[PDB]
Amino acid sequence: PISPIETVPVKLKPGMDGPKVKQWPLTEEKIKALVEICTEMEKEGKISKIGPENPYNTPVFAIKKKDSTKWRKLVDFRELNKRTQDFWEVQLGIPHPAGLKKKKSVTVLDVGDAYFSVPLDEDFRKYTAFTIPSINNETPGIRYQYNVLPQGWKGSPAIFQSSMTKILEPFRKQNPDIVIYQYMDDLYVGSDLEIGQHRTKIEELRQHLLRWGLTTPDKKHQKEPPFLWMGYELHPDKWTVQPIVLPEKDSWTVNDIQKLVGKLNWASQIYPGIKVRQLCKLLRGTKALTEVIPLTEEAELELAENREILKEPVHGVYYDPSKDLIAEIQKQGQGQWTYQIYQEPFKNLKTGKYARMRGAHTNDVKQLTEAVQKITTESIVIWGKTPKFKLPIQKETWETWWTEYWQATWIPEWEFVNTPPLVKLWYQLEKEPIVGAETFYVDGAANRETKLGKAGYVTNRGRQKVVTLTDTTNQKTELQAIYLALQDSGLEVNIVTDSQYALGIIQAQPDQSESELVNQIIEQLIKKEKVYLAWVPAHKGIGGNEQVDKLVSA
Amino acid sequence: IETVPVKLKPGMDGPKVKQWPLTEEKIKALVEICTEMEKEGKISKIGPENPYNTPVFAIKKKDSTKWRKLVDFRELNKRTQDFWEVQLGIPHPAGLKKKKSVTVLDVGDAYFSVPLDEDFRKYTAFTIPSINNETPGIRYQYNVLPQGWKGSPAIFQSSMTKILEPFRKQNPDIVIYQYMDDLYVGSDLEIGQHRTKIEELRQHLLRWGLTTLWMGYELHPDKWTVQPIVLPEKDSWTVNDIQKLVGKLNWASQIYPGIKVRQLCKLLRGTKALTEVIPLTEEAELELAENREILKEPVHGVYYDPSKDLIAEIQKQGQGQWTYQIYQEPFKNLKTGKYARNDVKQLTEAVQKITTESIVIWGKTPKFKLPIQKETWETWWTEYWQATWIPEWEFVNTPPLVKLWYQ
Numbered sequence A: 001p002i003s004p005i006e007t008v009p010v011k012l013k014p015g016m017d018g019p020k021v022k023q024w025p026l027t028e029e030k031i032k033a034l035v036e037i038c039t040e041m042e043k044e045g046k047i048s049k050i051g052p053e054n055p056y057n058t059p060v061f062a063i064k065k066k067d068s069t070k071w072r073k074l075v076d077f078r079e080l081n082k083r084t085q086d087f088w089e090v091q092l093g094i095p096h097p098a099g100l101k102k103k104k105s106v107t108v109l110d111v112g113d114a115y116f117s118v119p120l121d122e123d124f125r126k127y128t129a130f131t132i133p134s135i136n137n138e139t140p141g142i143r144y145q146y147n148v149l150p151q152g153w154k155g156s157p158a159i160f161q162s163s164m165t166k167i168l169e170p171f172r173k174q175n176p177d178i179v180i181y182q183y184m185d186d187l188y189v190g191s192d193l194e195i196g197q198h199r200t201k202i203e204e205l206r207q208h209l210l211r212w213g214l215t216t217p218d219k220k221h222q223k224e225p226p227f228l229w230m231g232y233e234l235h236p237d238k239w240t241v242q243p244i245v246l247p248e249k250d251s252w253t254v255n256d257i258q259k260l261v262g263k264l265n266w267a268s269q270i271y272p273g274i275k276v277r278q279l280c281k282l283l284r285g286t287k288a289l290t291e292v293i294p295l296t297e298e299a300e301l302e303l304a305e306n307r308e309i310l311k312e313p314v315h316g317v318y319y320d321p322s323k324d325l326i327a328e329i330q331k332q333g334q335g336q337w338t339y340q341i342y343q344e345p346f347k348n349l350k351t352g353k354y355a356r357m358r359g360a361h362t363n364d365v366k367q368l369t370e371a372v373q374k375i376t377t378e379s380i381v382i383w384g385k386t387p388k389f390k391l392p393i394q395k396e397t398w399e400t401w402w403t404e405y406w407q408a409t410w411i412p413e414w415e416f417v418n419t420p421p422l423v424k425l426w427y428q429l430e431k432e433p434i435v436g437a438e439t440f441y442v443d444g445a446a447n448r449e450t451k452l453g454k455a456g457y458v459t460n461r462g463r464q465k466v467v468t469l470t471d472t473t474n475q476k477t478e479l480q481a482i483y484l485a486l487q488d489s490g491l492e493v494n495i496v497t498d499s500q501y502a503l504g505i506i507q508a509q510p511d512q513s514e515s516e517l518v519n520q521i522i523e524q525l526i527k528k529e530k531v532y533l534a535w536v537p538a539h540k541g542i543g544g545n546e547q548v549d550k551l552v553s554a
Numbered sequence B: 001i002e003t004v005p006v007k008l009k010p011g012m013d014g015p016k017v018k019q020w021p022l023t024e025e026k027i028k029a030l031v032e033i034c035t036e037m038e039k040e041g042k043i044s045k046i047g048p049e050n051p052y053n054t055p056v057f058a059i060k061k062k063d064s065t066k067w068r069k070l071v072d073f074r075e076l077n078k079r080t081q082d083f084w085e086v087q088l089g090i091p092h093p094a095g096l097k098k099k100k101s102v103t104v105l106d107v108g109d110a111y112f113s114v115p116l117d118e119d120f121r122k123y124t125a126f127t128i129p130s131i132n133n134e135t136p137g138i139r140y141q142y143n144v145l146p147q148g149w150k151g152s153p154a155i156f157q158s159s160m161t162k163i164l165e166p167f168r169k170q171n172p173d174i175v176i177y178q179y180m181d182d183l184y185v186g187s188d189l190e191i192g193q194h195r196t197k198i199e200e201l202r203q204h205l206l207r208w209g210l211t212t213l214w215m216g217y218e219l220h221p222d223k224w225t226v227q228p229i230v231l232p233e234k235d236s237w238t239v240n241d242i243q244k245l246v247g248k249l250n251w252a253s254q255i256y257p258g259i260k261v262r263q264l265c266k267l268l269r270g271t272k273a274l275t276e277v278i279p280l281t282e283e284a285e286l287e288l289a290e291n292r293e294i295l296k297e298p299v300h301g302v303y304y305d306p307s308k309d310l311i312a313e314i315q316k317q318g319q320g321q322w323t324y325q326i327y328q329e330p331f332k333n334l335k336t337g338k339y340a341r342n343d344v345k346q347l348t349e350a351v352q353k354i355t356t357e358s359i360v361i362w363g364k365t366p367k368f369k370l371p372i373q374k375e376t377w378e379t380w381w382t383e384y385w386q387a388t389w390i391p392e393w394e395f396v397n398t399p400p401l402v403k404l405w406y407q
């Protein structure tokens, strides 16, 4: 059937006209298969023969998908697609199982020949004209145009979905308690009705759909639980990801590792503690997809931790709007974080993980905040509300950090939960210069041409050293100069620099970094008892800064 | 009742901005609001054949419990700038910033009475999303001038003139300026008299169907004294303090012509301890005094360039205090100020207060450089936002030094 629903007016992009691609001569058998297929479609109203006045055309092709016996018509809409207007996106996002409300019953109904059951805007049909060439293209071909949404055309997914929405509207208003999810040509229907009135309401839905041109399977061919969808396995009281099998291999190739990481990332949605950092490291660099990558000991350890997590099957539960949402986060180690979301203590709706930004100076408090933010965004998408957090950081630690930091940071309602390792700041800088401590005036210059550089200092106690660096940058030399001051100073020290860049990194109390230099400086800062860092204007001949800028420039 | 032709003018395409996820309570509020507007004919449900989209949010009205729809037309505004700025531009009165009191009145309701050019409606498309993406999402477009689009005041301009005509001629010295969906009314009257004139103005508007914290209802512009860069006044000065002073004066010497620091550089000779006390020579105590005088005055040489973008930088100072600067040419301050009371809430408030002053002074909103993480701002700004407009914003990392200079 062809639904009676009003058509969606369609147009080509402005300034463009319909496609006019020449039809390539086809073999006799393909021509025969096409004529047979088109005659069947013509009798059902899908296509109509057109006269020679229609100047448009799109290539047609016939394919026997396999060493099978069925021929399939394949229309090449690439040209028409480039000329067709843009459409609004079908879906803004995909539903997550953790956000689905519990139902007593859920049923799946698939629409048969979905696209062919929807009408195409009359004013646009002419542009879909195609031609079945005669043998050896000696005589005029047989011309046709579509009356329904063509397979492969750019507007079909969108027009079909909006058609399905308008068709369901009436039934929704009359049954505000029934839940209907549209997924391509599938319909998932759930309700809180008893198995008896449910099967009844369903039949009523099918009846309503049929009145609009959409056929569906009867209670005999309706699939049974669990439902496989978007890679999930959905059961009546719980959900999980489809069976995940970890490859058992002797030699791992780039291709095998990418597939492994992909499966682990997908599993991490409900299996707590999945790690991929060490596995992703192996994929760093450029390497042939068929190249064998030997596993480092860290990757071996991480792969074994994962196999262990994936040995005993775990599941997630559905959402209950009357209960609250709780999210817990745990530091797992080197920039890795893991979280679980639940309503009833330990019955996870879903889990997840968060990895620290690469190539950036940071500390545990910043990473936690980032993780909280990531979870907050996801919660709003999934449940439309922010959860209450349970974090591994003391209220005082957090308060000390946010009141001092120059950036605005805010965390929704949370409680401290003692689950080591705890988040803490490993050192803090003084707010005032220290008395009885040596003041180091540091500086670093680097000839941009030779790449040569020097880093040194001068103190109020007469000390002064100057080292030489090779293939360094002005930025790196300012950093080295600070590192030399820390290495040669006592437990307490005042450091004056003219490098705003260095001040910036250090004031943020970084605890982690990929830059060996910054990491060395951090190691020293933790050992100190008191460190006060000040900034002075570059070349203003300021006492101290000037007396050291000499020994460094020359 | 007579649509005004609108054109993006060949070159630019309509807006295709993605809709942001919203909490359940805001979605429900938007659905109720949009269902009413549809019945009333202000907007119409649209199909997939409209490829355009503009984000929509729900904020709380001047009231406390009344939800309001806020459409982010920042893209469409930029793409139709030739229309609202060049073709139907609304003049900004320089006299507004000089008045003793300025009151802000919402007049957005008026626009819903004027039909929008049928060929421009598609560009006003917006989407109400659903929780967990369980249903497609409700799409609509406008049939009347929408709030948030700079084209609306531009087109309603001639009607606004007629409406305010008798009030203006009766009160020649009151300045009335329209910016987006708000009206700015300034006078030098005594506060009681000023408030009485406003009530009368609301009555004029009522006859044409207009039921009209950081304080954006009653402003006192001729009292917006700039936040100077301040130089400490100590009994004793440590090396550290002088260095801080040199740093601050050095930064100010790039903005204010005449700033001198040679006398102080003298005090810092050699390699001394940060805590050492250094006696202030009268030759430098003089320089100090002279710099204080230049700093409490307007910046000489800096003027507003109508063709340039306004920039606003904001620094978190701590203890609920925030400093800000507005400029076009980096660090060439047209205005500096401060705002004092959570962190996100305080920032949104400072941003609304700064945008308002900007609208009063120059008749345009500045582009903000915000000291916060992109997602944190995006997730929370609407929880406290109360204005009907939305400025351009960027997310940046504050240079530790700048915060120190404007402390």
Ligand SMILES: [C][C]N1C2=C([C]=C([C][C]OC3=[C][C]=N([O])C4=[C][C]=[C][C]=C34)[C]=N2)C(=O)N([C])C2=C1N=[C][C]=[C]2
Pocket (backbone or CB within 6 Å): A095, A100, A101, A102, A103, A104, A105, A106, A107, A179, A180, A181, A188, A189, A190, A225, A226, A227, A229, A234, A235, A236, A237, A318, B134
């Ligand atoms: C109808 C919307 N639908 C949905 C499902 C499951 C539950 C949670 C309850 O799950 C149940 C409950 C009872 N049953 O008898 C079930 C039988 C099979 C699968 C789930 C079942 C609630 N809603 C579901 O299966 N699918 C594919 C789904 C949905 N909505 C959006 C995306 C996917």
Ligand SMILES: OC[C@H]1O[C@@](CO)(O[C@H]2O[C@H](CO)[C@@H](O)[C@H](O)[C@H]2O)[C@@H](O)[C@@H]1O
Pocket (backbone or CB within 6 Å): B017, B018, B055, B072, B074, B075, B078, B378, B391, B392, B393, B394
């Ligand atoms: O928050 C910035 C973010 O918002 C989007 C739309 O969601 O852009 C809006 O804000 C920008 C900055 O003010 C404007 O330039 C833009 O026109 C406006 O739509 C995203 O594009 C942007 O990343």
